[PDB]
Every structure is written in structure tokens, then in C-alpha cells.
């Protein structure tokens, strides 16, 4: 997980071609401090933790794994004019990592002060695992006067990521007919559902509930959640009780299961009275249910914690997924279970209130 992004970014540091195959499964020469510094500099954070670097590492790992899952490298080999694409890839991965995991009264400074909201760009590109294409939601591309293409956002304008790549990649992908710059504010329900099921790696798209209007921001948040618990990053959703959260991942799980009538979404209401024993019991029972579902259907269940902040056991809600442990026993990485939690924001009342 820490190796492959290191192998790519070490060669990305000094501008060099990468047409030679990578992932040799053996450790090439590498030193601790050089890779540590390289991960530090390209992350954006000036004072990052170790968890943030781990999160960036797993995100790059999962993104490169998606890249090798598709046949883009093989198509580059067989078409013989597709290189330099990986440079645009890696630049965009830095961009979405900066969109993902670089956060930032005198006592709510760490908690209430939220430097980033949903009123920020979400340029989202995924290499789907079920198919051999790529999909884009949440951003637009526009050509510039220096021969390159810049990224712009809806409702405003922005000049992020100047000087990305040349025109040969654009010509190649236009030959491959991949949906670049598709605006989802004027697309019908069937096509948006097809794109969503293409992105989540879901086969045989079936409508679970037509009444669930699925906006562009809904693409962004659903795919962010799925990406978060695909790459292994803990899923904590800092949305107010106003925002629709339970319905969101209920819809996600309903699509994920497809047509089975088993129990795939376990909704645990977290609450002030949630003693730690409550949490371990619920997680263990849902973990046995996860064994059953994975063994019988090759299907992944989800354990969703509602308002997982009012309890005094938020550390219990943290250990189950940050370091993969429940009540002091190492949870099984093979088991198969997506544990997500929804944490309420922090803000004082208005003084008159």
C-alpha cells in the first residue's frame, strides 16, 4: 500500500518516462527519510499528522490500483501514442487528495472552524473496476491560450491546475470516446443512474427507488463515500442532521446489493447513553452478519452509525476503523464490512438564542 505510490512518485520527482512496467513485487532500493519527505511535500499540508500521510498513501494506492485494473497501460502499449497520460493522472490524484484529506471560539478552534465546506470544487475522476473506461463528475475542462487545458467549476470560474498535459492525450481519449465534460444538470434519470452504476462497479443497474432525485452533488457525495471506504479511509461524515445522510447510504447499499432481499444496511443509532459495550456488541453482531453475507452472496454489508458524536465512546467509534480494533482485538481485514459514521458539527447558539 505504501510501496506502489512511492515507486511511482519517486520516479515522478525527477521527470522521467515510465513506459517500463512497474510493481515488480520486490523492494527496490529506498530510504526512509527520502520517501517521508517526498510524501510530505506533495500533500499540501504544512504540519501534517501521520494519519494524514497514511490516508494519502492509501488513496494513491487505491487510485493506482484502479488504474492498473483498467487496460489503459495495455492500450498505451498497443496504440504506441498515449504516453504522458500518467503525468496528468498523477497531477489529478494530487488534486483530489487535496480535495479529500488536507483539513485547515478559542476552544472550538480545532472542531468548529471548518476551512472547507461543500461550497468548494469536487473534481472527481474514477477508473471503474467493472469496465475499462473512466468517469468524471463535478468539474469541467476548458482549453487555454498556452496549448494546455485547465479545470473550471460550475456556478463560478476557477483556474486550478495550469499546465497539465499536451493535446496528444486529448486526441487519444477522444478516439476512445470517454465522457469528458458531461454536465449532469441536464441529464435524464436513466443515463445518470447508468453512469452511477458504472462508477460504483455495480452490474445490472436496477432502480431501487425512482423518487430519489439524484443531483450532481449527490454524485459527488455518494462517490466520495464509496471511494472513502474502498481505499480504506475511515468514513466520518460531518454533515448536520439537516443534510440527508441516512437515505444517501441507504440508496448506496440498495444499489450495491442489486436484487437480494438480505439485510445489508445495519443502522445503529449512536446516542449519549451508548456505553462501549453497546458498540462492541453491535459491531461484533454486524461482523458475523458480514461473514454470512460475504460467504453466501459475495456481497458487502455496511454498518452506519447515526449521530456518532453524542456518546462518550467516540474513541470506540474511532478504534473500530482508524486502527481496526474492537475492544482490544484486531478486526479481520478479510472479513468484509464497511463501517461509516455520521458526526454532527460544532457551533455555539446565537447569543440571543
UniProtKB/Swiss-Prot annotation:
Location(s) in or outside the cell: Cytoplasm, Cytosol; Lipid droplet
Comment, domains: Composed of an N-terminal stalk, a dynein-like core comprised of two catalytically active and four inactive ATPase domains, and a C-terminal E3 module. The ATPase regions do not generate movement but rather act like an intricate molecular 'switch'.
Function: Atypical E3 ubiquitin ligase that can catalyze ubiquitination of both proteins and lipids, and which is involved in various processes, such as lipid metabolism, angiogenesis and cell-autonomous immunity. Acts as a key immune sensor by catalyzing ubiquitination of the lipid A moiety of bacterial lipopolysaccharide (LPS) via its RZ-type zinc-finger: restricts the proliferation of cytosolic bacteria, such as Salmonella, by generating the bacterial ubiquitin coat through the ubiquitination of LPS.
Record: residues binding ATP: 54, 318
Family that this chain belongs to: Belongs to the AAA ATPase family.
Quaternary state and interactors: Monomer. Interacts with UBE2L3/UBCH7; UBE2L3/UBCH7 is the most efficient ubiquitin-conjugating enzyme E2 for the ubiquitin ligase activity. Interacts with UBE2N/UBC13; promoting 'Lys-63'-linked ubiquitination of target proteins.
Annotated knockout phenotype: No visible phenotype. Males and female are fertile and produce normal-sized litters. Mice do not spontaneously develop Moyamoya disease, a chronic occlusive cerebrovascular disease. Mice are however more susceptible to Rift Valley fever virus infection. Mice show elevated expression of MMP9.
Protein name: E3 ubiquitin-protein ligase RNF213
Parent-protein residues present: 2124 to 2495 of 5148
Amino acid at each position: 500500500a505504501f510501496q506502489r505510490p512511492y515507486q511511482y512518485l519517486k520516479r515522478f520527482h525527477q521527470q522521467q518516462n515510465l513506459d517500463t512496467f512497474q510493481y515488480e513485487k520486490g523492494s527496490v532500493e529506498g530510504s526512509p527519510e527520502e520517501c517521508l519527505q517526498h510524501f510530505l511535500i506533495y500533500c499540501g499540508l504544512i504540519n501534517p499528522s501521520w494519519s494524514e500521510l497514511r490516508n494519502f498513501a492509501w488513496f494513491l494506492n487505491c487510485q493506482l490500483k484502479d488504474c492498473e485494473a483498467s487496460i489503459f497501460c495495455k492500450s498505451a502499449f498497443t496504440g504506441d501514442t498515449l504516453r504522458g497520460f500518467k503525468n496528468f493522472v498523477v497531477t489529478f490524484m494530487i488534486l483530489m487528495a487535496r480535495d479529500f484529506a488536507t483539513p485547515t471560539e478559542e476552544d472550538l478552534a480545532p472542531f468548529s472552524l471548518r476551512k472547507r465546506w461543500e461550497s468548494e470544487p469536487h473534481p472527481y475522476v474514477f477508473f471503474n473496476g467493472d469496465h475499462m473506461t473512466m468517469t468524471f463528475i463535478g468539474f469541467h475542462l476548458e482549453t487555454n491560450n498556452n496549448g494546455y487545458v485547465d479545470a473550471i467549476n460550475p456556478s463560478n470560474g476557477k483556474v486550478i491546475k495550469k499546465d497539465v498535459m499536451t493535446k496528444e492525450l486529448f486526441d487519444g481519449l477522444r478516439l476512445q470516446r470517454v465522457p469528458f465534460n458531461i454536465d449532469f444538470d441536464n441529464l435524464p434519470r436513466y443515463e445518470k443512474l447508468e453512469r452511477l452504476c458504472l462508477a460504483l462497479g455495480i452490474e445490472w443497474p436496477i432502480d431501487p427507488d425512482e423518487t430519489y432525485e439524484l443531483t450532481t452533488d449527490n454524485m459527488l457525495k455518494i462517490l466520495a463515500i464509496e471511494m472513502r471506504f474502498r481505499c480504506g479511509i475511515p468514513v466520518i461524515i460531518m454533515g448536520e442532521t439537516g443534510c440527508g445522510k441516512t437515505r444517501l447510504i441507504k440508496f448506496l447499499s440498495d444499489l450495491k446489493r442489486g436484487s437480494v432481499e438480505a439485510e445489508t444496511m445495519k443502522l445503529v443509532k449512536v446516542h449519549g447513553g451508548t456505553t462501549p459495550s453497546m458498540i462492541y456488541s453491535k459491531v461484533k453482531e454486524a461482523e458475523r452478519t458480514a461473514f454470512s453475507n460475504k460467504a453466501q452472496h459475495k456481497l458487502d454489508t455496511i454498518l452506519f452509525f447515526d449521530e456518532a458524536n453524542t456518546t462518550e465512546a467516540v474513541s470506540c467509534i474511532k478504534e473500530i476503523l482508524c486502527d481496526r480494533t474492537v475492544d482490544g482485538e484486531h478486526l479481520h481485514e478479510d472479513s468484509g464490512l464497511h463501517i461509516i459514521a455520521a458526526c454532527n458539527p460544532y457551533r455555539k447558539h446565537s447569543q440571543e438564542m
